[PDB]
Structures are given as C-alpha cells and as structure tokens.
C-alpha cells in the first residue's frame, strides 16, 4: 500500500544489506545486483507499445518491500507495520522452524558475519 | 473539467519508526470480510 | 479445500490479513469465496530486550516477547498486548549472560519462596 | 505473497534448507528471489530411546 523507506543509519545489528537496497549515487536508484540483471539481457505496420510501469517505479515497489520485511518482518502485510530489532525477528524465524531462540541470541555476530560472506 | 495528465503516484509514503529496542504490539483487532471471484465454467457449444 | 475445509497458513491464498474460515456461496458458472481474516489495530510503542538475567544466568521467554511500560517488564504473547509478570514458569534459562547482545537485568520472581514464607 | 510477506513451511518452494527469510530484486521482464535458508552441517550419531 505504502512507500516503505529504510532509516538513515542502515545499520541493523551487523546484517549488512547494502548489495541489495539501493544505491543512493546513481540516477536510477538501482541496486548494485540489479545493476547486473539488467546488464545481462519497426517494420511494415508492425509496433512495440510501451509498458504502463516504466522500471523506476517498479524500483520503487521493491525498495517498499524490502524497507518493508527488514524493519517490521511480515507484519505489514496483515495490517499496521509494527516495529521489532532485526536482530528479533531472525530468531522468531528459527523457531518457526523448530530451533530454540537462544541460538541465536548467544550466536548473534557468527549468524551475521556468516550471512554477510553467503549474500 | 479537462482531461489532466499526470505522472501516478505509487502511493501513499510511510516511515516505519525502526530502531534497536523499540516495538509496537496491537491491543485490539477487527474481524474483516474479502470477497474473492473464481470462474469455473463455460458454455457448451457443438457446430 | 484449503480454504474452506481447513484453514490455511499460505499467505495471500485466503483473503488479505489472518485466515480464520471462508464462506463459499454459488455464482453462475463460478464460486464467490466469503474470507474472513483476523487483522490486528492500535499499536503501541515498547522497548524491548531478547533476555533477562537473573543470578547470573541468561532467560528467555518461552512463547512471547519481553516489553517495558517505561518503569517494568513484563512478558506479552505476540500478537495481543497482555502483560504478565516474568517467572521461573514463564521462561526458560540457556546460557550465561555473556554470549547475548542487549541483554537486560530485571526480578525473575520465583514462585517456591513466597509460599515457603 | 509466501515466502516475501511471510515464512512459508512448503517444502522447496522457497528454496533448498529450511526456509527463514526471502528478499526481492527487480529484473527486466521477470523477478529474481533471494533465498535464505539454514542447513543443518556437522552431525553426530548418538543412541536413543
Ligand atoms: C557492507 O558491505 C560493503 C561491501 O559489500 C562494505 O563496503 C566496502 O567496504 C570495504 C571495507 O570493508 C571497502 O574497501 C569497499 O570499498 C566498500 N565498498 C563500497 C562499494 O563502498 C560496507 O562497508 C559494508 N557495510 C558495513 C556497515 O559494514
Ligand atoms: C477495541 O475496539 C472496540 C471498537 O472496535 C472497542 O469497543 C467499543 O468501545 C467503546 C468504548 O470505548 C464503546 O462505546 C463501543 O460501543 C464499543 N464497540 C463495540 C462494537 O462494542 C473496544 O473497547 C476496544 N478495546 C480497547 C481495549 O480499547
Ligand atoms: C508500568 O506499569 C506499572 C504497573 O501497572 C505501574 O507501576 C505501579 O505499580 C504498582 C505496583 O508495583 C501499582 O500499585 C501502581 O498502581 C502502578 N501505577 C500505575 C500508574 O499503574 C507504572 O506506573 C507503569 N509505568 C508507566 C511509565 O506508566
Ligand atoms: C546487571 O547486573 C549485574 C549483576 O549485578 C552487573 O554485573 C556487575 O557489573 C559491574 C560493572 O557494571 C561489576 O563491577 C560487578 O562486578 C558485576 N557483578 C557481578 C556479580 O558480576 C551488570 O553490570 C548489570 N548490568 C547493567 C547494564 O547495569
Ligand atoms: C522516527 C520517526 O519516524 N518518528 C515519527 C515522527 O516523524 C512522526 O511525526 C510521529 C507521528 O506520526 O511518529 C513518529
Ligand atoms: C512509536 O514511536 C515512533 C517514533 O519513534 C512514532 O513514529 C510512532 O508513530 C509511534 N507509534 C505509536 C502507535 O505511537
Ligand atoms: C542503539 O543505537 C544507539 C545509537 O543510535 C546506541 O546508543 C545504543 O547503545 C544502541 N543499542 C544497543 C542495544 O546496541
Ligand atoms: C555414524 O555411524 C555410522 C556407522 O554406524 C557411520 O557410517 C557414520 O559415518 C557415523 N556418522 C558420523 C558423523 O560419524
């Protein structure tokens, strides 16, 4: 519904998601790995009409989304975005699939640092 | 009163109040109603 | 089936919000589905912490998150604001507190020795 | 819807491991999901009952 944005700080407890959110030095506004998606792909009364959304906007719906998930998880989706640390809403996910919380709490920089070389 | 063109707008623009040791938790809820419309057949036709 | 005979956890595939149940009603040549969703209102801001140490050990909640009203802590379930007092039979211990981040120090009541006098 | 606004538990639909979190990127013409999941490593056998 809503134009989601992240704060200016960027910083959500170690996770560092720069590769995905965008680049505020560029005309676009893309992301640096959307930068490499769109880098690698008239006639005798024939014609191509243009797309209602032009890819800024479309830009724009997946900031939303991601600004969305890292600062209230999937509760905006159901209704009012209600904030939680980051850091929270990782170990609720553990134990959606079964695995203890304090694994995460005690284990916070491991889980962090790991993710940041995986992404 | 003319036909205006404009630029849409994707919608309305909203912060979320992020920090590291805030929440927000509801106290009270509603109960909604959606509809939701499926076809499921067409007309029989022989030639 | 999945929307109707059940209830489903599949986000967006029974209406918009939580699925409750769904109402089937007949169309011609089609099905008109009556979803009703549980959608959460009026939040309020609290800070929060991921534990709580008490004797020098770390304790987490079993089901909830910990809040403050600004002076105390209390437990609440997730999705409806009902505070409780934290106590041994709320919680659960694991570790020290050394190993989390932004733990805080707060009275984990223990039932046994107020009945002991 | 299920694996962006939520946390689905439908095996391989939101990649391979358990899934925990999904983040979008736009693509032309098309979208690419981001998969995060966790994966089990290490084990030891042990004797039960
Ligand atoms: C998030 O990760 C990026 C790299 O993907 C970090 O930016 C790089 O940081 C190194 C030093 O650690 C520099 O040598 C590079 O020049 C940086 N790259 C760019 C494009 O500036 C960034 O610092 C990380 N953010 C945090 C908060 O750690
Ligand atoms: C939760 O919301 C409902 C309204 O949706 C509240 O119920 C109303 O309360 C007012 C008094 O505050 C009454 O005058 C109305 O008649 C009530 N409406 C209905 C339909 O009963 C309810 O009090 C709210 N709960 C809290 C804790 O604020
Ligand atoms: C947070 O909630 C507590 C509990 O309601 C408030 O503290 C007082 O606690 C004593 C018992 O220790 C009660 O007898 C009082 O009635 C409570 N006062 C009030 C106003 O509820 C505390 O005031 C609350 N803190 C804030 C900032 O509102
Ligand atoms: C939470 O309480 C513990 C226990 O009282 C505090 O640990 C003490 O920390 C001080 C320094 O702040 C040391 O001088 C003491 O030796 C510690 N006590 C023990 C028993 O180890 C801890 O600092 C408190 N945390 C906060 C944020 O105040
Ligand atoms: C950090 C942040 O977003 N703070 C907002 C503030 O800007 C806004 O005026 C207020 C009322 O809506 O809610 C809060
Ligand atoms: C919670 O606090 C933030 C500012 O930190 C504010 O923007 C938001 O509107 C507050 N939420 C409520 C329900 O007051
Ligand atoms: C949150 O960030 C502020 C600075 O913006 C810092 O003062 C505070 O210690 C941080 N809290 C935690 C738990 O790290
Ligand atoms: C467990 O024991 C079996 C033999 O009973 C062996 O094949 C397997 O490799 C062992 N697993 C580990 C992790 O050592």
Redesign the pocket.
């Given at each position: 519904k809503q134009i989601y944005k992240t704060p200016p700080i960027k910083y959500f407890g170690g996770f560092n998601f720069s590769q995905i959110l965008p680049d505020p030095s560029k005309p676009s506004k893309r992301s640096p790995i959307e930068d490499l998606l769109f880098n690698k792909v008239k006639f005798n009364g024939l014609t191509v009409l243009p797309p209602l959304l032009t890819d800024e906007m479309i830009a724009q719906y997946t900031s939303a989304l991601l600004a969305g998930t890292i600062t209230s998880g999937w509760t905006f989706g159901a209704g009012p975005a209600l904030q939680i640390p980051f850091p929270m809403q990782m170990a609720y996910r553990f134990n959606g699939i079964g695995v203890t919380q304090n694994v995460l709490y005690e284990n916070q920089k491991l889980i962090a640092n790991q993710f940041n070389s995986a992404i | 009163q003319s036909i205006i063109a404009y630029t849409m707008s994707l919608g309305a623009e909203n912060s979320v109040a992020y920090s590291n040791n805030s929440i927000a938790i509801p106290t009270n809820f509603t109960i909604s109603v959606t509809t939701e419309i499926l076809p499921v057949s067409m007309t029989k036709t022989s030639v | 089936s999945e929307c109707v005979l059940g209830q489903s956890k599949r986000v967006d595939f029974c209406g918009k919000g939580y699925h409750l149940m769904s109402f089937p009603q007949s169309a011609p040549h089609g099905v008109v589905f009556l979803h009703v969703t549980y959608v959460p209102a009026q939040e309020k801001n609290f800070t929060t912490a991921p534990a709580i140490c008490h004797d020098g050990k770390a304790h987490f909640p079993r089901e909830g998150v910990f809040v403050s009203?600004?002076?105390?802590w209390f437990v609440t379930q997730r999705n409806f604001y009902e505070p409780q007092i934290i106590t041994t039979d709320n919680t659960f211990v694991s570790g020290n507190c050394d190993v989390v981040i932004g733990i805080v120090n707060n009275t984990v009541y223990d039932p046994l020795q107020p009945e002991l006098d």
């Open positions: - | - | 009203n600004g002076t105390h």
